[PDB]
Amino acid sequence: RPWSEFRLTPAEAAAAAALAARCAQRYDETDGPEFLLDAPVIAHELPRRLRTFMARARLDAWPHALVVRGNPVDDAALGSTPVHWRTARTPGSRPLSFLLMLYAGLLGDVFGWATQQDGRVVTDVLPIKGGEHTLVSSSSRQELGWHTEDAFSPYRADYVGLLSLRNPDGVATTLAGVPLDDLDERTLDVLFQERFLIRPDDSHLQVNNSTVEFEGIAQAADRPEPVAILTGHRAAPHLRVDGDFSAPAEGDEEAAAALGTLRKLIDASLYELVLDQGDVAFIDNRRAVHGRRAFQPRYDGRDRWLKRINITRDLHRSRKAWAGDSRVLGQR
Numbered sequence: 001r002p003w004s005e006f007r008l009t010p011a012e013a014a015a016a017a018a019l020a021a022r023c024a025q026r027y028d029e030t031d032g033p034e035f036l037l038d039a040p041v042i043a044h045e046l047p048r049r050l051r052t053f054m055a056r057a058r059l060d061a062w063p064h065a066l067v068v069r070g071n072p073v074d075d076a077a078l079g080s081t082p083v084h085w086r087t088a089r090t091p092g093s094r095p096l097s098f099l100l101m102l103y104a105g106l107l108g109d110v111f112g113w114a115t116q117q118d119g120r121v122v123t124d125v126l127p128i129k130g131g132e133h134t135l136v137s138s139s140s141r142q143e144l145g146w147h148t149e150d151a152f153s154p155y156r157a158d159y160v161g162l163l164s165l166r167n168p169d170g171v172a173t174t175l176a177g178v179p180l181d182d183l184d185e186r187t188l189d190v191l192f193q194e195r196f197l198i199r200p201d202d203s204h205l206q207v208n209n210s211t212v213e214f215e216g217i218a219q220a221a222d223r224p225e226p227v228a229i230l231t232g233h234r235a236a237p238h239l240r241v242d243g244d245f246s247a248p249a250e251g252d253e254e255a256a257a258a259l260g261t262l263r264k265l266i267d268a269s270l271y272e273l274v275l276d277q278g279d280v281a282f283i284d285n286r287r288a289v290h291g292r293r294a295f296q297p298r299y300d301g302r303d304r305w306l307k308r309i310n311i312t313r314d315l316h317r318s319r320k321a322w323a324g325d326s327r328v329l330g331q332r
């Protein structure tokens, strides 16, 4: 498989769950400043075999994601899937949110955005009635097209963590790497040049938050400066693209041809990852784009529901976008 996979033994999974419950018992909230600081140290008490996997798998050159299977989730204890992300911090989902943050802490520094789900660090992915054909993760009937998370921003995550609270009908997350086996060197050269526009996605709009950082989003949408799609090593490039929000620099037809080719090659090599209940994936946001297949929402209380978190290897890389001393990014 193009991702690195780990399956917890029932004993390891039980121990991890017990640790997260202990944290849920001792701290007021996952996003509080206290638990943000402690989680990386508390995570040192997770099962050793898991810590070894996370430390090694992160350093391998190839995987598109790190996938951990086998966290128990009791649907009766969990309760119904929320109708909106606003009311999605239910008691039943609370221990699993702490669990996600513990796992996340093994990989880097977690953060949120001031313009996304009210600045929450642990966010929710679930279908929202009336929003089936939007370009955000609360869509359903319309496929969520492939993208680098927060492609518009230089402070975008290195890893995106997704923990499946439930997914009864096996709806697939989509993934693709750099199509290096098919890109010719001329097209590759052009993708490495600063000749592309990448605007902020709809999740950063005021309409997708509850009733100053929105100024910076407006500027990124109105006046995007040319950037490259590929960076770093030519034999293993890092990727920055959004299928629905990328464009060539104005009038640049060679850049346009390279992006058109890239779209075609990514469409053709897109593959599926089904996060069953209890599965956690940490997607390498520099090696891979991701999305989610179209699905018919239920709206009966058992819709697919994920908890999500953004992770950077270095929080100081984004200090320009710090609001205060919080873990919430944004600019004017």
Ligand SMILES: N=C(N)NCCCC(=O)C(=O)O
Binding pocket: 135, 136, 137, 138, 144, 145, 146, 147, 149, 201, 202, 203, 242, 243, 244, 245
């Ligand atoms: N091709 C796209 N739709 N890109 C934007 C994806 C939005 C997203 O991941 C979120 O809702 O947080």
Ligand SMILES: [Fe+2]
Binding pocket: 137, 149, 290, 291
């Ligand atoms: Fe995403």
